[PDB]
Enzyme design. Structure first.
Site, PDB file in Angstrom:
ATOM      1  N   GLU A 156       2.304  -8.381  -6.171  1.00  0.00           N
ATOM      2  CA  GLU A 156       2.281  -9.799  -5.814  1.00  0.00           C
ATOM      3  C   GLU A 156       1.639 -10.587  -6.950  1.00  0.00           C
ATOM      4  O   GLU A 156       0.506 -11.068  -6.829  1.00  0.00           O
ATOM      5  CB  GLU A 156       1.537 -10.017  -4.495  1.00  0.00           C
ATOM      6  CG  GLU A 156       2.165  -9.307  -3.302  1.00  0.00           C
ATOM      7  CD  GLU A 156       1.342  -9.441  -2.035  1.00  0.00           C
ATOM      8  OE1 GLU A 156       0.297 -10.126  -2.072  1.00  0.00           O
ATOM      9  OE2 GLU A 156       1.740  -8.861  -1.002  1.00  0.00           O
ATOM     10  N   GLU A 280       7.169  -4.524   1.814  1.00  0.00           N
ATOM     11  CA  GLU A 280       5.983  -4.624   2.656  1.00  0.00           C
ATOM     12  C   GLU A 280       6.290  -5.468   3.882  1.00  0.00           C
ATOM     13  O   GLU A 280       6.898  -6.536   3.767  1.00  0.00           O
ATOM     14  CB  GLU A 280       4.796  -5.233   1.900  1.00  0.00           C
ATOM     15  CG  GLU A 280       4.113  -4.298   0.923  1.00  0.00           C
ATOM     16  CD  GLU A 280       2.834  -4.888   0.360  1.00  0.00           C
ATOM     17  OE1 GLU A 280       2.295  -5.834   0.973  1.00  0.00           O
ATOM     18  OE2 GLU A 280       2.370  -4.409  -0.696  1.00  0.00           O
TER      19      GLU A 280
END
Length: 362
Positions: A156, A280
């Site tokens: 991320e 995720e």
């Protein structure tokens, strides 16, 4: 050493659903642990047990065949500019990757909670150097691995500390992330061995399922072996909210929000022929196993119709004030929430057959 020369769209078809080894090799404890004296001690510094092969075999019994290995390299990297990776750490990462790989499953190896890949224009030049040096050693360590080993360039990448961190990004962050993704793709493709035909995953800004991140996401047009990495804990209040506004029911407003974000993935990736993996996702434990089971089956049913697989985030946390995404008790090798696993199997279109389930307390 063999590697199939097939496209990501065709390789993704062989995937059912995934599981994350969270809060393990991504655990970062440099503020109190001496990485010199404990070169592989960070693996358990967040409370998880030492990883063994039986954890993955227990999950493959329940038809998991994708295993994402979140790995943090901060603290295991030498001084600049060579950025030598600690040999003992690289070996332990190699051993854990072999647990699901040597049993025939898909494996995703990533760069996770790093201090140096922040999407700030102030330090991109040195960040691109460290990213290239790190991925040079990783691609070298796993040269002779087949198509079942997948590299994920970043987790991320974002502007940590800014209000722009979790809202989708700004023009600065989008350009830095795109540049960092380009360095990752070039570094792996330029290495030798099977890395020219290895499948690579790249995230948008913060891997966010947001319009601003989706609109400003450069994707290669001449590489059929590149995958988009998206994280989507949707709806937020039911799945990810660990504070005010958290809800334990999967209501109609929660279904509308989830349907909206699933449609964002379809318009951005599925319709445009961009192979994509939900690397995720998950729903936090709120003593609502049957609410999360119906949510999981519905979520799985929708994206299965789109041909997109999802990977559950499991941090090994079940109780307390932290984020409780635990799904398997790694020490006892038991499925703590068997109806959630059954929902993943039924929504994916498989035969429901939950093994190694936890006993019933009553």
């Amino acid at each position: 050493n063999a590697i199939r020369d097939i496209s990501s769209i065709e390789l993704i078809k062989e995937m059912r659903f995934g599981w994350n080894l969270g809060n393990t090799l991504d655990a970062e404890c440099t503020s109190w642990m001496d990485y010199e004296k404990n070169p592989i001690g960070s693996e358990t510094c967040w409370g998880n047990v030492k990883t063994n092969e039986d954890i993955f075999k227990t999950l493959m019994d329940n038809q998991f065949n994708v295993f994402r290995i979140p790995t943090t390299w901060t603290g295991h990297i030498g001084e600049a500019p060579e950025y030598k990776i600690n040999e003992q750490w690289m070996k332990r990462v190699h051993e854990i990757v072999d647990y699901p790989y040597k049993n025939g499953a898909f494996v995703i190896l990533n760069i996770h909670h790093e201090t140096w890949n922040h999407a700030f224009a102030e330090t991109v030049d040195e960040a691109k150097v460290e990213l290239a040096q790190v991925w040079k050693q990783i691609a070298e360590e796993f040269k002779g691995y087949g198509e079942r080993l997948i590299f994920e360039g970043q987790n991320e990448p974002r502007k940590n500390g800014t209000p722009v961190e979790w809202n989708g990004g700004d023009k600065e962050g989008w350009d830095v992330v795109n540049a960092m993704n380009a360095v990752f793709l070039e570094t792996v493709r330029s290495s030798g061995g099977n890395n020219a035909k290895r499948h690579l995953m790249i995230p948008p800004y913060a891997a966010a399922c947001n319009e601003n991140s989706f609109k400003n996401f450069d994707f290669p047009e001449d590489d059929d072996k590149v995958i988009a990495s998206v994280h989507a804990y949707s709806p937020y209040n039911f799945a990810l909210n660990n504070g005010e506004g958290a809800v334990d029911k999967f209501d109609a407003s929660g279904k509308n929000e989830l349907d909206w974000n699933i449609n964002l993935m379809k318009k951005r990736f599925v319709d445009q022929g961009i192979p994509m993996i939900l690397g995720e996702y998950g729903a936090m434990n709120r003593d609502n196993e049957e609410e999360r089971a119906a949510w999981a089956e519905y979520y799985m049913e929708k994206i299965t119709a789109l041909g997109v697989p999802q990977v559950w985030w499991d941090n090994g946390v079940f109780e307390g004030e932290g984020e409780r995404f635990g799904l398997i008790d790694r020490k006892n090798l038991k499925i703590v929430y068997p109806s959630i696993v059954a929902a993943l199997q039924k929504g994916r279109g498989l035969e429901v057959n939950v093994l190694h389930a936890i006993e019933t307390e009553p």
